[model samples]
Target: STGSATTTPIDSLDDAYITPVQIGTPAQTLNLDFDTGSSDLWVFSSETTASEVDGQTIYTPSKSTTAKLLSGATWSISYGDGSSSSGDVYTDTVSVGGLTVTGQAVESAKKVSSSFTEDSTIDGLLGLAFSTLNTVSPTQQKTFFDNAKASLDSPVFTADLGYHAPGTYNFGFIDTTAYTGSITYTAVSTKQGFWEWTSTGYAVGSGTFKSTSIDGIADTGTTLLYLPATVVSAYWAQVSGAKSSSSVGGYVFPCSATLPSFTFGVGSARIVIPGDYIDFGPISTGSSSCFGGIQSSAGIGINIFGDVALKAAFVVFNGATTPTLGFASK
Candidate 1:
């Protein structure tokens, strides 16, 4: 079966995107962050601590006849942003768009960190990464995509994230109208349970392409694009009054500085990122200094092609026995 859903940015900065998901016998619609970096389809539920509940919606398993507890099963996950959640497991009917999966593992959160509580936009997360990364103990659960892959017209899903606009997530097939030109396909390594791939190279603005292989993960969960310090420094150096400030915790530049665009290679295709996207936002409200969306990944040891880069193109996650990633201009 094939289906599609609209993904809307949570805020003006495009910090995160969320999509509606239906669960249980009588559908309980909840907006969830479709994260490609993790592999646990968890949610805020009736089992969550009362004090931990904020303005987010909760999933009540007891109210659904189709909800069945997965006895002894438990899960816990901590994100790179330091936010975390944990809970027991339940099997229920889960649906995204119009595509339905029976007996899908739906983790009901019992505890959640303050970050999640403070952000009232998203109710939970729907992990799109490989199921090998699932946190459930005693019996690991498959991701929503994995459970529905067999029934899909094609073992693939596409991400068309927008720039301060609503985009789309398509399952089972790629929407030809979503992109332009031919797709550039690249092999993806699931070693770390991520959509890891090697970038052909990159260039600053209209400069020449640097012929180097930079390995990184295409993570939809993350908010910014992180590259090698050398690459990040080169990009920022081109802008006047730009510096890596310890106090601000990242590269910040004068709001009036002229910023240049960034370009990265995927196979023979070169994707260009607009300069406006790099000027993430002001360091502080009404401040004259602005933070950059492109930052150094030296501290993490691995580069991350987050929403900043992904939003510039249409991406396809091919889930064949040997997985592959496809990118196209949109």
Candidate 2:
């Protein structure tokens, strides 16, 4: 059966959007961030030490009669943002929207990094990445999408994230009404467990789009856009006075600087990101100071089209066959 769920942006923190998920027999609902960059359905749980948790809601696997341990299995994961969690595994019926997958491997966190522990609203991370990226010990676990793919209508999911607005995640279907213009399809290379694709070339400001291809991944878990250092430097150079500042975080420029529109290529179609969106928000310590929404990906191993890039367009992740990505204007 197909299903759909509304997504909400985090308050103040325009970071990642979170959606509701249910785990267990009777269903213990939890608000989880559906991340396409990862592949583990891990949750903060009763297994977490009291010292490791703050105000976050913990999933109680023991309370569910249907929950069973996976014997000696365990899972652990880390993010580029430096957040991490480790835990044992439990098999339970996990439900999202109208679809339910029985015997889903759910990782119960016994420990989490400060970055995750401080984030009280995110009860867990529901990885939507390819199943090959799952972190279960011994035998790798399949993602919710993979396990439920057999019964799905089309084996596709759409991530309709928005700017300070409620969006939606549709499983096994695509809602044409949720997006505008034609949906442009691009091939996804999942060699590294991400929706990796190449940009034909990009234009800084109002410049022409070049034919240079920048290989990058579409990561929903990351909060900001990250391009090659050369690309980031070139954009900031056009901003009059932009400087790399660790204190301000990443590259910083005047909040009122004349920001230029950024555009990335998807085959023949170009998904343009507005200038204002690239301006991000002003630095917290100094309102006059602003953090560049697009940062350098020099040492990050790969460039990322994060929330800033994703929000600029409607993204469709097709899990069927070759696993392609379809985009359209919102």
Candidate 3:
């Protein structure tokens, strides 16, 4: 069995991607963010406090005869951005695209942090990372993909993130025509519960490629690309008015400055990010200072190849016994 879903960006800057998910017997459809960085299928629900709910679609388990409470099961998760949510658990029929999984653990949020409350774009998050990262207490739960992998034609999923257009997430089989050129495969380290891998190297616009080993995670949940301070500095140095500013928090440059493209290596394959994609956005509406899409990963512990980098190529999360990641230019 195979399934495919179209994912749409939440904002103009492509802040995040969301896909419609069907939950419960009556099919309460909610837009959920598919996050490859974390593992926990959580959602805004009727259990959530009214004050904490913003404009998000809430899942009501009471309305679904198929929904069964997972007694004694509870979950709580926090992100690097400091946002958090805690909730009780329920097992129900959940469907994404045409893929359906019975008895899927559907975490119903009881309380969500202010950041989540304010963001109306996503109803909740669907974690695609390993199930070992699940936050449920007493007993962990398998993610929707993990539960459906065995029945899929092939145990793989692909991420085709877009720049300004809609992208897709395909489960069970690879769409050969989705990308061009041969895919460069790399071993993945799932010990961290992330799609972590080591990059071969990188290069600034029209500059010599620097051969080095850089370890990072391909995180769909994160908005920007983060790398080592050294690599980030090297790229920004090429920009005329680029500087590290505390006020703007991280690297910022004059909006008028002509930014250079960034290239990263996946084995021998090089993926290039256009200059326009690096100019994240202005500091404020009509402001002359703009923030960069690529920033230093200093203090963050792990470097991230977020949407900014993923949008440049097609990514595959191959779920073999020993998983591997595949990257191809599109």
Candidate 4:
């Protein structure tokens, strides 16, 4: 069974995209952040304290007859962004678009970090990372896609992430209409439960391309395009008045300063990121300062080609045989 859904962007923050997911029987639709960076399908639920509820929607298991608790099974996750969620587990019916998976383990949050609790716009997270990274205790859990793959016509998924626009996330089959040209396939190393790949090289602005292959992750959950401090420093050097700000955080430059395009070598294809996309937004609304979209990945210890970079191309997450990533111009 093939399935597809619309990917909606968050306002202003541009942090991540969300998709509708139905959990439990009869369907309780939740707007979940489909994160490719982490593995754990968690949701806000009755298990969470009312103080934690605030403007967030709660998932009530009592309303779903198919919900069954897995006693003693627990889960806890802390993100690189400092947000966290932890809770008990339950087996329930989960569906996205038209695809459905039965007895999928769902983590019900009992405690969430201030970042998650304060953000009423984000109800929960739908992890698309490898099942090996699942948080369920006693026995690790399989991701919804892992469980649903057997029933799919094709063991593939496509990510069409757009810039300040609605995109499409298709499962089982690729939507040709979502992208253009030929897709360039690259080998991926999933040793760390992430879709990891190496860029052949990159260049800032219109300068010559550098054959500097760097390891990076295709993460939809992360908001920025994080390269190494050295790489970022080189890129920023091309921009006038750009510097690493200890107080403002990250690499900041004059908001009025024009930025050059960033080009990354992926396989035989050259993925170019326009300056507008890398500009991100102003540090503060109407402020004279702007934060760079390409920042140092030193904090995370790994380079991440987040949504800022991923949106520049249509992505394919191939799970069959050897995992691989395919990219095409949109």
lDDT of each: 0.94, 0.87, 0.94, 0.88
Tens-digit lDDT string for candidate 3 (116-160)? 999998999999999999999889999999999999999999999
Give residue 122's lDDT in candidate 3 (0 to 100): 91
In candidate 2, the residue pairs with backbone N, CA or C atoms under 3 Å apart (3 or more residues apart, or in different chains) clash, namely none
Please provide TM-scores, in order, for all candidate models, with all chains considered together: 0.98, 0.96, 0.99, 0.97
Q: Point out where model 1 deviates above 4 Å.
A: none
Clashing pairs in 4: none
Candidate 4 lDDT score relative to the true structure: 0.88
Per-residue lDDT of candidate 4, residues 29-121 (tens digit): 888998888889999999997787768777899999999998999999999887888999999999898889999988999998888878787
Model 2: per-residue lDDT, tens digit, 119-189?
Answer: 88899999998888999999899999999998998999888887777788889888888888898988889
Tens digits of per-residue lDDT for model 1 on 157-240? Answer: 999999999999999999999999988999999999999999999999888899889999999999999999999999999999
Preferred candidate (TM-score higher): 1 or 4? 1
> What's the true lDDT of residue 104 in model 4?
92
Runs of candidate 2 with Cα error greater than 4 angstroms are none
